[PDB]
Amino acid sequence: SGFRKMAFPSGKVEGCMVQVTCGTTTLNGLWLDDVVYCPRHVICTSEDMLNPNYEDLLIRKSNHNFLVQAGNVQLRVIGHSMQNCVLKLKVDTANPKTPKYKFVRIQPGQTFSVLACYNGSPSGVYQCAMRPNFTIKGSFLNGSCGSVGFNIDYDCVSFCYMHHMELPTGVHAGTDLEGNFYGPFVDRQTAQAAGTDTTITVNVLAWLYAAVINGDRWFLNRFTTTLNDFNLVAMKYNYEPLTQDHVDILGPLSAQTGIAVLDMCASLKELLQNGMNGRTILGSALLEDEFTPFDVVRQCSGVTFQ
Amino acid sequence: SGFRKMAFPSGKVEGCMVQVTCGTTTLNGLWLDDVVYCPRHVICTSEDMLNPNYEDLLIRKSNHNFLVQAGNVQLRVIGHSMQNCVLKLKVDTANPKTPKYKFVRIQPGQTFSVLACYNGSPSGVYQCAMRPNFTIKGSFLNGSCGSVGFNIDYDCVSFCYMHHMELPTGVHAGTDLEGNFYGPFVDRQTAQAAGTDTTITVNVLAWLYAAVINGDRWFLNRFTTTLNDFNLVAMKYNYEPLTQDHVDILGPLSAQTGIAVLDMCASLKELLQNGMNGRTILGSALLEDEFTPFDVVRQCSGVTFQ
Numbered sequence A, B: 001s002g003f004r005k006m007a008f009p010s011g012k013v014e015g016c017m018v019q020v021t022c023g024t025t026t027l028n029g030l031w032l033d034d035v036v037y038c039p040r041h042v043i044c045t046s047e048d049m050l051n052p053n054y055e056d057l058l059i060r061k062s063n064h065n066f067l068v069q070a071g072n073v074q075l076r077v078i079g080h081s082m083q084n085c086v087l088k089l090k091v092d093t094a095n096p097k098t099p100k101y102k103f104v105r106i107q108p109g110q111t112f113s114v115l116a117c118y119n120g121s122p123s124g125v126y127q128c129a130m131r132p133n134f135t136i137k138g139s140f141l142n143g144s145c146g147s148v149g150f151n152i153d154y155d156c157v158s159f160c161y162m163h164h165m166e167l168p169t170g171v172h173a174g175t176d177l178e179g180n181f182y183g184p185f186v187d188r189q190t191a192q193a194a195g196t197d198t199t200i201t202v203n204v205l206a207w208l209y210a211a212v213i214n215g216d217r218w219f220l221n222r223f224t225t226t227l228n229d230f231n232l233v234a235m236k237y238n239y240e241p242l243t244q245d246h247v248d249i250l251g252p253l254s255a256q257t258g259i260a261v262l263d264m265c266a267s268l269k270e271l272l273q274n275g276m277n278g279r280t281i282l283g284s285a286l287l288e289d290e291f292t293p294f295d296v297v298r299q300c301s302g303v304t305f306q
């Protein structure tokens, strides 16, 4: 037992990380088959980042201007193209460490592991949620651009995120692996508004079920509620409205613990209205929203990958 | 910027994980060079776990009784020996994925990454501290025994922990890779007392410095204190006494932020005496003690591994 914020094992992704240098700019790229993916702003200088004309900047570049290094291995670039906010560098060698993989666009409230990298070298791994406002709260220093987010299902790596930016507010933005930003963000040095964010209600309830499975049960009460009454509380506390789709996804955890989803909603309502009263739940003094119901079932079941 | 509880990239360790089966018991082993390391209680049945005579149980076993599988690869066992609480299975093939590595015994209050594994297959990675009472608060289901803890310095993996037990209180115990338990624990199914635990003061102060570097500064105050006065507060709140050795280790962070260590101690004293007043620090509503000063400098500096 016990419950921790756990990331996927990073090995299959470590094998794909490279360094991409264009002129004086260095960041990370992802080497899959004979293609290297990286943020398009590798072609910019600090001067350019105000309002870059990426089409004009890339026209100045030839294949031999993109230096790609995997550890000591130098890769030969034989093609380049821009897709949305990413550059695709065709190389003459397929990555021998390419895992089974897909590209996916994740939904807000879904979770993924980030492999933070600098100069193509893995630094660390942590678990993130895509916020309702399409930002992530990561850990990314200058040079982390091109680090990727992913999930693993058995042997298949689903890449969902590439790091592009830190907003002046200190939060993080990036793209899917086709180079489309999550949220309204653009790859330029401007102040950019993120939506007002909300708490991911279905994830808090998943985590409450994780707490009960692990013997933290002090917050269970004598009460129940309705979807309608609960959503009035959710509104007041800036929580996502709970839908029957969310109730359905919580079905397995409700079945395991024997606690009806609306009974767990009545526990959450009391926690929102009264606070934690100086107590903790699974080592936390606030309501945690970065575990999906699938996360909770996986960690409670001991699912593995190859 | 941003600050997350980040684990080491797990790839070098994933390459070393195997399954070890003896009779009907299956758990994880660590394949380094031509030796597989695993918990000795692989040789027990549930019946045996009350008070196992491990010397007598191992005498009944021959090399061919230990089934070792790395993915599909079956390994040939050519020797076995018990060292303290671990079994060392000599195999006829050196692991080709063996990283540069050392075995280390970590000190209480130090941190490490855990690769949780089941049937020799990696499940997830998370960051842990060795508690002052030599327990860890992990996430370990039945079959996780033999999962390992580690740190990485550049290309060298320092193995510090192998998982052996969950205490009836739901906390976790294990050994170094020479098979010596951390703390007073024994590998048998008995109730076993853990020491009274304390909060790792030097780690809380490290994390306060991380908070200031990341722009969380609401807890900084007009006050200072002395080591003596601070330790009176530490006692009352079950924090480790702070020593000059701890002040010295905090020197780099004090230098970066320009906040004297005893000034940061006066912030911590006010936080212990007044609480957080419904506010957060780096996303936490309590005082976090699982980042070492070295952790904070690494994450703030972007150190990488190969």
Ligand SMILES: *[C@](O)(C(=O)NC1CC1)[C@H](CC)NC(=O)[C@H](CS(=O)(=O)CC1CC1)N[C@@H](c1ccc(F)cc1)C(F)(F)F
Binding pocket: A025, A026, A027, A041, A045, A046, A047, A049, A141, A142, A143, A144, A145, A146, A164, A165, A166, A187, A188, A189
């Ligand atoms: C990120 O884009 C990244 O890692 N880019 C490459 C250049 C490392 C990162 C996050 C915004 N950007 C920067 O770190 C960069 C600072 S730097 O050029 O000094 C890199 C340092 C390791 C040497 N900031 C530029 C930037 C802003 C916005 C953006 F979307 C991309 C880059 C800056 F400051 F010019 F605007």
Ligand SMILES: *[C@](O)(C(=O)NC1CC1)[C@H](CC)NC(=O)[C@H](CS(=O)(=O)CC1CC1)N[C@@H](c1ccc(F)cc1)C(F)(F)F
Binding pocket: B025, B026, B027, B041, B045, B046, B047, B049, B141, B142, B143, B144, B145, B146, B164, B165, B166, B187, B188, B189
């Ligand atoms: C752990 O020792 C482990 O993973 N061991 C091997 C057997 C998987 C783990 C934590 C205590 N122990 C158990 O999971 C085990 C339950 S089980 O045999 O049903 C394993 C299950 C996946 C099939 N508990 C035994 C045990 C207690 C204490 C100990 F130190 C080791 C084992 C028990 F219950 F018999 F005591």
